[PDB]
């Protein structure tokens, strides 16, 4: 298969570490400048749990495309093309989470 | 014709909500959180061998797996069905005693077909269609 940037997994992991460093650098500017209704600590934990959401993939081209999608999110976060509405739909302040046990999923719907 | 014009039964006299025995003696509409709690409360009391389930009919082979595990974990072999098959000799074991062991394509591949049990035209009617197709398209002695 043809590569994208990375000939292995650890170089793309270093690119993931660079993007996480730049996101952790960027996010208090987009807490203070955004007039946002959060602190910086659970925003950084939201960045960390969004990194841990796609933690299971060991594929280098998939994580390189995750690197360019995180770079586009970084490009729309360093500049303020995203707003205070778009920037924190990730927190799910309104949508209730779907329950994971069998009994509440039995009570809620045919799933 | 039964299974192609019995779809209209699926929207008539259909149970929708869990129902419970009332204090007066009627059946009233309650929730799953009360009804299954009443089932588990009366299921933890009676145990061992006096818990029985008669299944049968329009019932899944996953439902029998779940019922068989749920009543073998309260160690009862009382899983009875609707219709009677004999288990005095070779009932449940050795799967040639309750199947169509010949293939239904091999119902064409026959010469003499005996029917001791039942008429096929009012009881599994597409088997009567396959035996009529074999009876017409080749010579075949039905008794």
């Amino acid at each position: 298969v043809k590569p994208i940037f990375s000939r292995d997994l650890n170089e793309a992991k270093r690119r993931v570490r660079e993007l996480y460093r730049a996101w952790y650098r960027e996010v208090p500017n987009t807490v203070h400048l955004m007039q946002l209704d959060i602190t910086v600590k659970q925003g950084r934990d939201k960045v960390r749990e969004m990194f841990m959401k796609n933690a299971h993939v060991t594929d280098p081209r998939v994580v390189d495309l995750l690197v360019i999608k995180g770079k586009m999110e970084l490009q729309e976060t360093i500049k303020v093309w995203k707003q205070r509405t778009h920037v924190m739909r990730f927190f799910h302040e309104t949508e209730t989470p779907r329950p994971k046990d069998f009994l509440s999923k039995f009570y809620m719907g045919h799933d | 014709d039964k299974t192609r014009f019995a779809y209209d039964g699926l929207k008539r006299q259909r149970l929708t909500e869990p129902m419970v025995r009332n204090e007066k003696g009627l059946l009233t509409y309650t929730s799953w959180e009360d009804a299954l709690s009443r089932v588990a409360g009366m299921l933890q009391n009676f145990e061992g061998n006096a818990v029985a389930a008669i299944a049968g009919g329009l019932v899944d082979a996953e439902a029998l797996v779940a019922l068989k595990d749920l009543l073998n974990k309260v160690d009862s072999d009382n899983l009875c069905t609707e219709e009677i098959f004999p288990t005095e000799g070779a009932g449940t074991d050795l799967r040639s005693n309750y199947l169509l062991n010949t293939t239904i394509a091999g119902v064409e591949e026959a010469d003499v077909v005996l029917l001791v049990g039942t008429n096929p035209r009012f009881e599994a009617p597409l088997f009567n269609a396959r035996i009529r197709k074999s009876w017409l398209h080749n010579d075949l002695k039905v008794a």
Binding site: - | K73, D77, T87
Partner: protein, 84 residues
């Protein structure tokens, strides 16, 4: 405490089910008529690791992977799961 049921699986043309095929072709009917209340179920299919599932009381089971045996100790294996 007792053996509630036993479910024996079987393949069709694999050589790993030949010993339990020898058991089912000669040494089954005397085991069934020694105790007719205890059902020794036979559930065959194609391309299966052959097993015996001796399901005991209260939902527990014992799974013996009855693979690649001879004409000697298959009946000693399920008489061991009957006695134990």
């Amino acid at each position: 405490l007792g053996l509630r049921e036993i479910r024996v699986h079987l393949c069709q043309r694999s050589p790993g089910s030949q010993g339990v095929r020898d058991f089912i072709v000669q040494r089954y009917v005397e085991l069934k008529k020694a105790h007719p209340n205890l059902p020794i179920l036979i559930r065959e299919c194609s391309e299966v690791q052959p097993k015996l599932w001796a399901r005991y009381a209260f939902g527990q089971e014992k799974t013996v992977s009855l693979n690649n045996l001879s004409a000697d100790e298959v009946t000693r294996a399920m008489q061991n799961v009957l006695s134990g």
